[PDB]
Symmetry: C4
Subunit: 351 residues, 4 copies
């Protein structure tokens, strides 16, 4: 019997061909939609629907109270980071709620300290708890999701993550998750892929997770690797219901941290929560910077405008119809020309 | 049942593998043709044939009256842009017609203002109206094509675009188009692919559009992404009858705009019609510059000379025979060496 | 009958599609393992098991007595290079043994001088002889392995290499090898691939060698091409039992050679044993430098920490279970973003 | 019926997947050969065998009398260029013959002037005439080959080229060619691929030409695209019997032209015969420079040493056995690391 063409005799050892955002484009289709008439609302969890399908990352250079307030007023939501004392994180929940009863989420870990943290966040009025781990396919993480749903599931929605396979998504569904968050390795500041050699390209990861979550009516959050407004449309077309953003929002005025004027240009700090500086395990993130991008409200306008364009091109009046759109796969020659190919750019572009 | 190897259980979710110009080369074939004896004429529309199968883009940094006159004298045609008052665009049609009864086209949009614009262009003597949109697969665009053909179709030829699929091309054929223009996302100044995440590699887009248009006798115009004279031969071999050029003609003396002397070299401005500067919707084009290339007549000579070489290599005495030629697909290793590989270039090359 | 799509009529002329480390990632799986509880021990040979599955290369800029002592104290082993007089190499074996009865190996060639060298190394107390060649699929190399096993196989373990195919691995098994070393062409300082045009991508080479060695109970050593801690996890998941490292250990304090302070940064020399300088045949290696990395103990801690992370993600409590893990294949678009994509790195990272 | 996945309904429109040298490596195999015992002789034509399987290109910056003498003394042969008067080219043939009865070839074109040129070269004692064209699949080129074989075929061997397909090779065989030269588009100074859009990756081109020529006993010359000594071994393993070199020999002392000292380094001019400067048709080559490489004898020693290494690794005692070797295909990740990957090179390498 002949060998597998990539080696050995086991045809499942190399189990899939993984695609990322840069591997695909959305195909145009018959349309009665123009960008102005599209409806961008979508489910975050079983019980919570957002006007704009975007949430901010649970990172100490992205989301504290100011970012959470701005995201909710823009039609989305923030998830408050957990690298601070319990009493401080609960106090930031209260600040958001005192600003008009806006929606807000907060991250917790696994264990006894995470349990006390969760209970205080619920008492402060949080709307969504996010069980926030690098590898949710573990009975200890699944147990935390189920116990929270048992104790406080009548008062708050419970998200679990992160996963990158169909079987891991199915395990979170069976544990009672109200939404499943997808992304192992794709983040802009991530080094898991080179430190551990572990990961999963995000378009294939979303397609596989959706195959378990959609038949059960559980929404999927696409978390990490989004670099452009067009990546939001690709993630939702693959079947996700919302997208979580770190790098694209870290440059805004509302993100924590001070402006950095260096060599006449302006930047802000952005770092992984598994970086050496955040942990103070071998590190699995870097510490860096991103260009300054101005007010959050202006960034969200550009991002939703790109999503609305995609809905016009694909004939999608709602996000539920966008989830039925088709892709074409592209080669390396097709990608390299999508970044403005061969024209000395002379003026600024907002998107 | 086993999953699709790229994810999920739907084998049509990723519907095709899209090829662009850099993915293919034309195979040599048995030949009684040398470059001097080839015939480059081809249909622009059902009723109009050109001596050279090239038209200039409807852009305010490419085609006004001077470019339209030069293109017609060289054996091709210009399409006048529509980012100016109706009375000014109609006046430029008259200037061209006063220069020897040369052929000329003009762009119009969709709606009531576009209707008055179209009627004035017809009164001024235009030969071709181009219904000029980003996404022609919409009943409002199809309706405009059909109404123009109904009202003035005896006096003028009507083109519709742009499309990138077989089903969209078929819809324009059924609406009565005299030619179908292909290109969603491929232009050198385009950012649709990153802003909306939407597009289609141009060799596959032409192959699919031709599968609908050729059986109906409707010519296809390949619009956008052509970077070299060899790309013209590839587009026509895929089944197109003419090609539309922006970047390759924006550097010429006849294009609108002033020379730019910077750092001892010379350039000219070139910008998308969906850029912030042209629109004065989130932008879907950039504003930039290209190197100065001299007189139009000299550029067209180099472009047609490359096409004539391809006709010799493939044994094609006419464009209709070139449309029957075959491709070989190449890998990333093959492309990277096609741009002069590993020889410090010391002298200028005209093509 | 139709041709093979890549040319000719022989479907076995291009016999396989070869994958390297950068072509694959490990998929996360169901897990009861966290990095702290993983067990990293593994077989070097039939009779020798290591606490950490890493050995240092037999190169005159990587392993003499100081490196061999440090590797053994860290739980791995060193292989002493053979570019020095027999009496000097045997003396370095004694120095290691005088430092606590630590484990040590030593390289030998093929022929009569290599035979006297081997006998002196055995008298000095070496634990492992490595028959060290560029192409072990030769009866002269197979003969050396068998004769050593016949004469001294009761006192010492005998490794043979290097190979890159299933048939070559099977020949070493039949000759009596206690372990088989895999790698023809992959090393960081290797030029065999461009000088001779010969090689085999290392993930496919390991998969093929394991298909012959695992059914016979013979461990496989993955030798060359490892650039990151994650590559260790990939090599072992493909079926290898240990990995051999040159570049990743050449920068350490214990490697032979003096520090190089140039332009404010620090480096150390690193060269192939088939380079012109080492041979003093056309050369098949280069002479270069690598950044200084500090104490060996600190480098091994970072490398094993990355391996432990991979064991947590894949649910592997032992190396024998890691050898059963699955891969996903990635495209060029997926790789280019795994090296920290689009975030100006500002702080140092240890791994 | 479903479409072809790359577009349209014709499965032969994209007819093959073309591989170049960088797409493949030679697999090691069972061997009783070391580099010193290999035999590198091979047929140039039906009646002429060379000791080293290499010829120099017919270019006015590569081969005049000095290069032809040095190539013959090294065991190969030169082909004299034809961009000079007939009386001068015939005089250079005589100079070579006066230096010891060495072997020599000379290029001619097609037509009446080429006929007089050919007759004078034969009277001067040339051993091989090369009918030298860009596209030999034409009855006018086939006619020239047949007429020369009819008139002078008893006294001289007749080569025809260039071709890139099985059908074109078969046509030259039927016309009576004594050898067939393969290469449309691959040369380092070629711009045919971008000017005309025409070409064929060279490993696939050789495989296809050999499928026609080997059953007829007609040797194949691989012409263009060879960048490293390892590329010679790849070309011969694909079935060619000799290789023709331009860039790799243009830097030598014996090549025509003067040394160029610029910025402390030394270069020499190298240009295509279809460049603007050589023709004094749109140009299909560039004018450039290459690094100075010293005496020819030293370059040929390095090239044959790399070939001998490949023969050891593949178990080939003769070139006829090397023509039976197997390839593994590699990905972009495998190639990028074959050029010395990630080690600051500090010393010079001869190959
Ligand atoms: C469930 C458990 N969660 C915690 C929470 C707080 C801790 N606080 C302090 C310490 C430990 C803690 C573990 C364990 C190590 O000793 C100190 C845990 O295993 N988490 C974990 C393990 C490995 C990796 Cl890679 N990532 C995360
Ligand atoms: C994302 C999380 N990993 C870490 C790792 C190190 C940390 N070090 C310090 C701090 C935090 C850390 C979180 C969180 C914020 O407070 C400081 C994580 O994967 N947990 C986890 C829990 C249980 C299981 Cl079974 N597997 C994994
Ligand atoms: C050190 C490392 N720190 C973080 C922190 C936050 C993260 N947030 C999101 C993601 C990752 C994160 C890693 C990694 C995967 O991509 C998503 C971490 O906890 N490693 C880890 C390894 C194995 C297992 Cl069993 N448990 C945990
Ligand atoms: C058919 C229709 N054409 C026009 C023409 C002129 C207009 N002039 C002014 C304004 C509008 C106009 C629309 C609409 C917005 O309000 C101001 C239109 O929908 N075109 C359109 C919509 C969305 C996108 Cl992305 N691209 C183009
Ligand atoms: C190409 C065209 N898009 C735009 C967009 C914004 C513009 N903004 C300003 C101006 C122009 C603009 C054209 C044209 C020139 O005058 C100024 C377009 O796609 N129209 C269109 C019409 C109907 C439908 Cl259903 N879908 C799309
Ligand atoms: C803002 C944007 N402006 C332009 C202007 C001219 C163009 N000309 C040609 C092409 C494109 C163009 C885009 C985009 C696709 O490639 C071809 C545009 O109108 N967006 C748009 C989006 C969705 C829908 Cl339903 N309607 C229109
Ligand atoms: C088995 C044999 N081993 C030795 C050992 C020591 C030597 N010492 C000196 C010399 C030779 C030696 C050969 C042979 C050449 O003359 C001088 C040998 O053939 N090894 C070899 C051959 C070709 C290549 Cl590429 N790599 C390695
Ligand atoms: C790795 C080994 N190749 C070389 C080549 C040249 C050398 N030149 C000088 C020195 C050494 C060399 C080793 C070793 C250290 O001493 C100096 C090798 O492949 N041997 C080998 C033996 C038998 C057969 Cl059948 N095939 C190959
Ligand atoms: C000159 C060259 N020198 C070395 C030295 C050490 C090496 N160590 C490991 C590896 C290689 C090495 C090459 C090359 C393949 O990758 C693994 C060598 O001996 N060439 C060689 C060629 C053909 C045959 Cl039959 N015998 C030997
Ligand atoms: C067979 C024929 N050979 C010659 C030879 C010498 C000539 N000398 C002068 C001139 C011509 C010549 C043609 C033809 C053009 O007028 C001047 C020819 O057609 N060769 C040719 C044609 C096109 C291309 Cl692309 N490459 C080569
Ligand atoms: C390689 C050859 N092409 C050229 C083109 C232009 C030239 N211009 C000037 C000169 C030479 C030229 C050769 C040769 C040297 O003298 C000066 C060629 O393909 N011929 C050819 C002949 C017959 C047919 Cl049917 N097809 C093609
Ligand atoms: C202008 C151009 N000049 C050269 C000269 C020497 C060459 N030598 C070798 C090769 C090529 C060469 C092109 C091109 C293909 O690759 C091999 C040439 O003659 N074009 C040409 C085009 C079509 C036809 Cl029918 N006839 C000839
Ligand atoms: O240190 C880390 N390593 C890996 N992933 C991380 C780390 N910190 C945060 N993440 C993930 O990266 C996401 C942000 O990715 P980005 O939007 O591509 O910048 C977060 O929402 C987390 O899921
Ligand atoms: O802003 C824009 N976005 C996208 N495509 C555009 C825009 N403006 C013009 N185009 C298209 O780009 C073509 C020119 O492409 P190029 O020849 O590759 O420079 C035009 O003929 C239009 O079809
Ligand atoms: O000159 C040489 N050419 C090719 N491979 C070599 C040479 N010297 C050593 N090697 C191999 O390269 C390995 C180290 O590779 P690295 O860890 O990628 O730097 C060694 O363990 C040998 O197997
Ligand atoms: O102007 C030209 N265009 C294309 N190919 C050329 C030209 N001049 C020479 N050649 C070919 O290029 C080969 C040399 O290629 P190289 O060895 O890769 O530099 C010659 O032997 C010819 O077959």
């Amino acid at each position: 019997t002949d060998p597998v063409p990539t080696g050995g005799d086991d045809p499942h050892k190399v189990a899939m061909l993984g695609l990322t955002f840069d591997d695909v484009l959305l195909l145009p289709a018959a349309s009665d939609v123009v960008p102005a008439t599209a409806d961008t609302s979508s489910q975050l969890t079983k019980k919570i629907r957002l006007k704009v399908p975007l949430v901010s990352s649970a990172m100490d250079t992205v989301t504290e109270s100011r970012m959470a307030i701005a995201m909710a007023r823009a039609g989305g939501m923030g998830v408050l980071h957990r690298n601070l004392p319990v009493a401080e994180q609960a106090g930031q929940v209260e600040m958001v709620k005192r600003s008009g009863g806006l929606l807000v989420g907060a991250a917790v870990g696994v264990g006894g300290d995470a349990w006390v943290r969760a209970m205080m966040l619920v008492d402060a009025g949080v709307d969504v708890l996010v069980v926030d781990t690098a590898h949710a396919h573990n009975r200890l993480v699944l147990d935390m999701v189920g116990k929270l749903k048992s104790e406080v599931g009548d008062r708050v929605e419970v998200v679990g993550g992160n996963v990158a396979t169909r079987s891991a998504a199915a395990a979170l569904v069976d544990a009672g998750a109200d939404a499943v968050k997808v992304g192992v390795g794709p983040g802009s500041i991530c080094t898991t892929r080179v430190v551990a050699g572990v990961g999963a390209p995000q378009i294939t990861a979303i397609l596989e997770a959706v195959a378990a979550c959609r038949p059960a009516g559980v929404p999927v959050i696409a978390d990490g690797g989004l670099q452009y407004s067009g990546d939001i449309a690709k993630a939702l077309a693959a079947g996700a219901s919302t997208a979580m953003l770190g790098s694209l929002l870290a440059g805004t005025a509302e993100a924590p941290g001070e402006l950095i004027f260096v060599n006449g240009k302006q930047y802000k700090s952005y770092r992984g929560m598994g970086s050496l500086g955040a942990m103070r395990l071998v590190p699995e993130g870097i510490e860096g910077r991103v260009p300054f991008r101005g007010p959050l409200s202006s960034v969200i306008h550009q991002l939703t405008g790109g999503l609305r364009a995609a809905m016009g091109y694909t004939g999608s009046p709602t996000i539920e119809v966008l989830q039925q759109a088709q892709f074409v796969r592209i080669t390396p020659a097709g990608l390299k020309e999508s970044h403005p190919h061969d024209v000395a750019m002379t003026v600024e572009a907002p998107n």
